[PDB]
Amino acid sequence: GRAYKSKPPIAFPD
Numbered sequence: 919g920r921a922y923k924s925k926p927p928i929a930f931p932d
Contacts, residue, residue, distance in 0.1 A: 920930035 919932050920928075922928045
């Protein structure tokens, strides 16, 4: 549940 707004948008499944 870790999504980043910056590009590239990196999202961690937590």
